[PDB]
UniProtKB/Swiss-Prot annotation:
UniProt entry tagged with the keyword Cell membrane: no
Function per UniProt: Chaperone that expresses an ATPase activity. Involved in maintaining mitochondrial function and polarization, downstream of PINK1 and mitochondrial complex I. Is a negative regulator of mitochondrial respiration able to modulate the balance between oxidative phosphorylation and aerobic glycolysis. The impact of TRAP1 on mitochondrial respiration is probably mediated by modulation of mitochondrial SRC and inhibition of SDHA.
Self-association and partners: Binds to the intracellular domain of tumor necrosis factor type 1 receptor. Binds to RB1. Interacts with SRC. Interacts with SDHA.
Subcellular location: Mitochondrion; Mitochondrion inner membrane; Mitochondrion matrix
Lineage: Eukaryota, Metazoa, Chordata, Craniata, Vertebrata
Protein known as: Heat shock protein 75 kDa, mitochondrial
BP term (GO), one: negative regulation of reactive oxygen species biosynthetic process
Predominant location category: mitochondrion
Modified residues (Phosphoserine): 98
GO-annotated molecular function: ATP binding; ATP hydrolysis activity; ATP-dependent protein folding chaperone; protein kinase binding; RNA binding; tumor necrosis factor receptor binding; unfolded protein binding
Full-sequence portion shown in this chain: 69 to 551 of 704
Tissue localization of expression: Found in skeletal muscle, liver, heart, brain, kidney, pancreas, lung, placenta and bladder. Expression is highly reduced in bladder cancer and renal cell carcinoma specimens compared to healthy tissues, but it is increased in other type of tumors.
Top-level taxon of the source organism: Eukaryota
Family: Belongs to the heat shock protein 90 family.
Positions of post-translational N6-acetyllysine modification: 158, 220, 228, 311, 318, 353
Amino acid sequence: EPLHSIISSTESVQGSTSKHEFQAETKKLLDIVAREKEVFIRELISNASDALEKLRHKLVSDGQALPEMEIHLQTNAEKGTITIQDTGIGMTQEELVSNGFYSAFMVADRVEVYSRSAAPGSLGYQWLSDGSGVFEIAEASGVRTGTKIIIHLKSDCKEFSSEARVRDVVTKYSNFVSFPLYLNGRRMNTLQAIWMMDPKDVREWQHEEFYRYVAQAHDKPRYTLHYKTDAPLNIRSIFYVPDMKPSMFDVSRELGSSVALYSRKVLIQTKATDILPKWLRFIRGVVDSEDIPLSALIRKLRDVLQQRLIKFFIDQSKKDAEKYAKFFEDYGLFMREGIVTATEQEVKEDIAKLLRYESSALPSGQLTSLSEYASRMRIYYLCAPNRHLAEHSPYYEAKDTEVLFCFEQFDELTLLHLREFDKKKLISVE
Ligand SMILES: CN(C)c1ncnc2nc[nH]c12
Ligand SMILES: [Ca+2]
């Protein structure tokens, strides 16, 4: 039996507990906090992961051996309890007094905590609170290094004492936790949050495996962007462009982005809706940012990613012009839609930087960007069925001025919405 559990009633308190008042703010908080509810598992697992990370980081800095670093969850139906224990850095009495965590009171009639700091010669402490105006602290024996939280669920939340209900919660939210997580002695997590890895270390087989998981697809990604940054915000993200052509569902999908939102390897909202501009909904991948509450002021992240993705495609066109040509053929509609739907001029020009057209100066079949046309001028366009019809259209013959050639009616409406590029106005020949 490969059952591995570490949770047991080893703690004991010798003397009585001292009673403490909750700060003015905290007391108000515990009431608002206790008004869905299942997210507390997410919060507690994330807290345990942080605790384990601090200890592991400290032990490596001191070149000391690493102990068992695990997160364990236990459910007890007879006692109506849910317990989470980690073998992390723990807490001292000072940190325990000051003491995310209070999300436990969403479902708890009373909370019971045992913690022992990893520092040598530390003591175990017991922390008790019913979510009222008083909590209790006392020295405890038999407290394992790390932290143990025992939640006595109120009758309205007894479901969280069932292994089936908790297992569904853990799998949905905490699938990518970086430390081994156990539920009633059974290992749960096996997926790797590859977006946290060093971009140059991720192997092609990992990107393909992850793309198929996030996109629920069976093809491969033709483009992969591993974007990590901390200057504006904290961003750990990977974006994939499917190898397939866009599907009728992709072009007509409403209120979806096909991008997962994460915070510290913990899920925030699967199929995040407003993480990317709607015209980038054909993108698959994940966005991880610790600067997320847990739904108004996210736009700053959306604009940063739009610019980064637009830069990525501009670079892709320069690295391989032929691969980008078919990408434009397959996904150009999204870019024209993004311009038609844009409201500010600077975004329209940025997206338009991705658009490709044919030119009278270049041979049939060769593409050119609006910037390359602007570079060579000493912006005029003509929309016609095809190239030969364009050269023979009366509008074109009428000074060694080069003219861009569009073929679709959306191209014209796109250029019509994009009045100007780089302060050069767009004027149709005919
Ligand atoms: C809740 N909180 C602030 C914590 N501090 C340190 N180690 C912990 N292990 C689980 N929760 C912990
Ligand atoms: Ca994976």
